[PDB]
Amino acid sequence: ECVPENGHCRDWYDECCEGFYCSCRQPPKCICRNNN
Numbered sequence: 001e002c003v004p005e006n007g008h009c010r011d012w013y014d015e016c017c018e019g020f021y022c023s024c025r026q027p028p029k030c031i032c033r034n035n036n
Contacts, residue, residue: 005032 002017003009009022009030016022016032023033 003032005034007032 003014003022004017005020007016008014009016009024009032010028011022011024011030012027014022014030020032020034022030024030
């Protein structure tokens with residue numbers, strides 16, 4: 001279990017799953033976001 005979708009992440013420390021990439025709009029605020 002990684003950080004799923006709409007789970008709040010960090011493209012540096014808190015890893016989103018392989019299936020949704022960690023979209024970090026302005027660090028530290030981020031979520032998991034699906035690759036489409």
